[PDB]
Design a protein around this motif. Sequence first.
Motif, PDB file in Angstrom:
ATOM      1  N   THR B   6     -31.690  12.375 -52.963  1.00 34.21           N
ATOM      2  CA  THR B   6     -31.941  13.688 -53.878  1.00 34.21           C
ATOM      3  C   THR B   6     -30.656  14.281 -54.108  1.00 34.21           C
ATOM      4  OG1 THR B   6     -33.934  14.159 -52.778  1.00 34.21           O
ATOM      5  CG2 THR B   6     -33.239  15.807 -53.670  1.00 34.21           C
ATOM      6  N   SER B   9     -29.280  12.492 -57.028  1.00 35.62           N
ATOM      7  CA  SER B   9     -30.257  13.187 -58.303  1.00 35.62           C
ATOM      8  C   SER B   9     -29.492  14.135 -58.660  1.00 35.62           C
ATOM      9  CB  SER B   9     -31.437  13.282 -58.199  1.00 35.62           C
ATOM     10  OG  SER B   9     -32.184  11.794 -57.643  1.00 35.62           O
ATOM     11  N   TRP B  37     -30.138  22.837 -54.609  1.00 36.94           N
ATOM     12  CA  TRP B  37     -29.924  21.635 -53.964  1.00 36.94           C
ATOM     13  C   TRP B  37     -28.526  21.613 -53.440  1.00 36.94           C
ATOM     14  CZ3 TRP B  37     -33.870  18.705 -51.691  1.00 36.94           C
ATOM     15  CH2 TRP B  37     -33.507  17.871 -50.677  1.00 36.94           C
ATOM     16  N   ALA B  87     -35.075   8.913 -62.091  1.00 35.30           N
ATOM     17  CA  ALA B  87     -34.963   9.835 -61.055  1.00 35.30           C
ATOM     18  C   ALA B  87     -36.081  10.860 -61.467  1.00 35.30           C
ATOM     19  CB  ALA B  87     -33.867  10.460 -60.671  1.00 35.30           C
ATOM     20  N   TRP B  88     -35.825  11.608 -62.432  1.00 37.27           N
ATOM     21  CA  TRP B  88     -36.757  12.539 -62.885  1.00 37.27           C
ATOM     22  C   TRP B  88     -37.921  12.526 -63.232  1.00 37.27           C
ATOM     23  CZ3 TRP B  88     -32.537  14.643 -61.559  1.00 37.27           C
ATOM     24  CH2 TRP B  88     -32.645  16.036 -61.213  1.00 37.27           C
ATOM     25  N   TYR B  89     -38.472  11.322 -63.724  1.00 37.17           N
ATOM     26  CA  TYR B  89     -39.806  10.897 -64.027  1.00 37.17           C
ATOM     27  C   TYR B  89     -40.727  10.912 -62.726  1.00 37.17           C
ATOM     28  CZ  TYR B  89     -44.004   8.778 -65.676  1.00 37.17           C
ATOM     29  OH  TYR B  89     -45.418   8.641 -65.758  1.00 37.17           O
ATOM     30  N   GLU B  90     -40.013  10.644 -61.480  1.00 38.26           N
ATOM     31  CA  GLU B  90     -40.972  10.500 -60.077  1.00 38.26           C
ATOM     32  C   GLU B  90     -41.523  11.827 -59.891  1.00 38.26           C
ATOM     33  OE1 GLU B  90     -41.923   7.372 -58.978  1.00 38.26           O
ATOM     34  OE2 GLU B  90     -41.110   6.731 -60.840  1.00 38.26           O
ATOM     35  N   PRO B  91     -42.504  11.721 -59.129  1.00 36.52           N
ATOM     36  CA  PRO B  91     -42.799  13.025 -58.542  1.00 36.52           C
ATOM     37  C   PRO B  91     -42.233  13.591 -57.370  1.00 36.52           C
ATOM     38  CG  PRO B  91     -44.770  11.302 -58.254  1.00 36.52           C
ATOM     39  CD  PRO B  91     -43.511  10.661 -58.860  1.00 36.52           C
ATOM     40  N   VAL B  92     -42.015  14.904 -57.438  1.00 36.55           N
ATOM     41  CA  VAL B  92     -41.345  15.417 -56.274  1.00 36.55           C
ATOM     42  C   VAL B  92     -41.866  15.296 -55.013  1.00 36.55           C
ATOM     43  CG1 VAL B  92     -40.735  18.051 -55.362  1.00 36.55           C
ATOM     44  CG2 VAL B  92     -40.688  17.625 -57.808  1.00 36.55           C
ATOM     45  N   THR B  93     -41.137  14.916 -54.031  1.00 39.53           N
ATOM     46  CA  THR B  93     -41.344  14.572 -52.663  1.00 39.53           C
ATOM     47  C   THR B  93     -41.392  15.934 -51.985  1.00 39.53           C
ATOM     48  OG1 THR B  93     -40.434  12.540 -52.986  1.00 39.53           O
ATOM     49  CG2 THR B  93     -41.155  13.176 -50.601  1.00 39.53           C
ATOM     50  N   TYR B  94     -42.450  16.577 -51.467  1.00 42.26           N
ATOM     51  CA  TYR B  94     -42.309  17.833 -50.742  1.00 42.26           C
ATOM     52  C   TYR B  94     -42.116  17.467 -49.176  1.00 42.26           C
ATOM     53  CZ  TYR B  94     -43.796  19.762 -54.978  1.00 42.26           C
ATOM     54  OH  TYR B  94     -43.747  20.529 -56.177  1.00 42.26           O
ATOM     55  N   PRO B  96     -41.766  18.411 -45.209  1.00 43.68           N
ATOM     56  CA  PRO B  96     -42.628  19.243 -44.232  1.00 43.68           C
ATOM     57  C   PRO B  96     -41.802  20.450 -44.049  1.00 43.68           C
ATOM     58  CG  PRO B  96     -42.752  17.166 -43.099  1.00 43.68           C
ATOM     59  CD  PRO B  96     -41.474  17.165 -44.214  1.00 43.68           C
ATOM     60  N   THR B  97     -42.532  21.747 -43.729  1.00 49.41           N
ATOM     61  CA  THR B  97     -41.930  22.889 -43.430  1.00 49.41           C
ATOM     62  C   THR B  97     -41.003  22.887 -42.275  1.00 49.41           C
ATOM     63  OG1 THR B  97     -43.885  23.962 -44.721  1.00 49.41           O
ATOM     64  CG2 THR B  97     -42.388  25.602 -43.396  1.00 49.41           C
TER      65      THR B  97
END
Lengths: 197, 196
Positions: B6, B9, B37, B87-94, B96-97
């Motif tokens: 990340t 990116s 970030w 990198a931008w194309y991929e889904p955001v990986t969220y 855990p809180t």
Amino acid sequence: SAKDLMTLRSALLALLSSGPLTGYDASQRFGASVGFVWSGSDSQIYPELRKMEAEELLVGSDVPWGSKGATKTEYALSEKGWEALRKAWYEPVTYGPTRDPARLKAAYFEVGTNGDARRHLRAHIAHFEQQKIQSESMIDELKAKTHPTLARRLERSPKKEHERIVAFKVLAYEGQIARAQAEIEWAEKGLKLLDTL
Amino acid sequence: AKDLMTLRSALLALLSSGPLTGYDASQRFGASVGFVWSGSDSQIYPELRKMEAEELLVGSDVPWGSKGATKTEYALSEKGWEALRKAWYEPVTYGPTRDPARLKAAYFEVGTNGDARRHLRAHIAHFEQQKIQSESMIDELKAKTHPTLARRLERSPKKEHERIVAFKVLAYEGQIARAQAEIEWAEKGLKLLDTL
Ligand SMILES: COc1cc(C(=O)[O-])ccc1O
Ligand SMILES: COc1cc(C(=O)[O-])ccc1O
């Protein structure tokens, strides 16, 4: 990052203040309760519980496990553990710098198409909507006093304190909801922006 | 681990505004993308070196002072640009809180109601401040005077400018929305403390 390990230690002390648990049970109960605000996995929790006992913050002893005659080691806070919990809580919160992968993604949506940006914002909404429903559902278990970690905590607290203890658990989940709702509104504002570009 | 990819990116995104030495990369990062970030010197410098070794950046010597010393400037390679797009194309990986303020609030009964007030007031102060910082950032994005944004715009076709800037502002509007939610939450907590 050692600050994150110390915070995991604090979350385990908080959970174990509701009553002694085996390693396995601690990790199951953790993930179903405090783990929603500070996540910890099995492989993180087991070694920290062992260090905490080595440091004498926890006292280990053998209790019956199952009904076939097996025993397991359950961990309870020592007086040193109780002090450490109190001291950890008194310390100010250290705010870690912002690491938000979705805001990062949004900041540079121009790298892809507007259609790609819409997909990212819809996935943001989906994520925080599901978080909101989990948080609202957790509040309902807390207010019913049926959540199994909460129920054990209450059985070990004077009745005079129950309103306070429950109110703070609810407060934490109201905070998850408030944030979830802000994230959804933000993404929706982003979707409308995309129609003007 | 995935946190390093990340940061990578973030660094590809920043370097798409133009080539930078290691120092200027770290400095510009901390004044731009680092607000959403964050990266410390201990992560950024070795990530840049890894990115060069994997040929996503090309390093070259440029004059450093006027006595013939040189320093290394890093530019995205063709593979770097490709990596940025993929990198931008991929889904955001969220993740855990992990929120230290929510953890603290959850167990406020560990201390006094006074201790809880101190924590919530510190929380409000922290996010009132993040809010003002983000608002200041939006003024310089909209004015197009932020030096990384200005450099980005000098390198982009005029037709893309509206879009480039709007997305930077969107990111900070997100920071503002979250901050306002945190403040409201903490104020509700303060009111709660008075009822106990
Ligand atoms: C902080 O989240 C929780 C904590 C507890 C507890 O420690 O009694 C129970 C349920 C929860 O969801
Ligand atoms: C994501 O945050 C920023 C990015 C940029 C940029 O790369 O042009 C400029 C200013 C910022 O605050």
